[PDB]
Amino acid sequence: MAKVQVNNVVVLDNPSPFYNPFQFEITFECIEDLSEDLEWKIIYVGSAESEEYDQVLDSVLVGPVPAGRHMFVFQADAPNPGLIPDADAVGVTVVLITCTYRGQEFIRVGYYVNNEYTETELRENPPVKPDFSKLQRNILASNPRVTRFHINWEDN
């Protein structure tokens, strides 16, 4: 008895500029009729060195809809480069899309975002300081940490 079961996620923001917006073509199946708005949020771990930095790129609200399996296309402008530390910026990070209905999260696509330089030289030998402008977000679609939960979409 869930109202939305997100199934597929065709990430478009595969390794592209860090200043390119997170593009998630999610295909979810609205299993039931909805009452409130569906809150898909993209949470970019602001520091994989400190998780409490988790930033929020955007949150799309899909209102009450009478079920239906279909795809929508997420995009969200990049995080604050100042929020990310060295080891995270030129490193591995996660950007999770927690679908949050009624303030209750019922799924989490923890897409590992591997931030590695765009320019081959910089991949050859990563500059000691993180260049978010040279940074390319490789959204590891080979490693989607999908953690979904069951929530009360109702008031029971």
């Binding site: 949470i43 771990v45 520091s47 994989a48 060195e49 400190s50 998780e51 988790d54 080891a87 995270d88 490193g91 591995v92 990070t93 996660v94 999770l96 927690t98 949050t100 209750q104 999260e105 989490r108 923890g110 590992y112 940490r145 953690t147």
Partner: peptide, 18 residues
Amino acid sequence: GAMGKDIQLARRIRGERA
């Protein structure tokens, strides 16, 4: 320090965001 980036992220995904 936080060298284990993976596990940091694993935290947030497993149930740390919420």
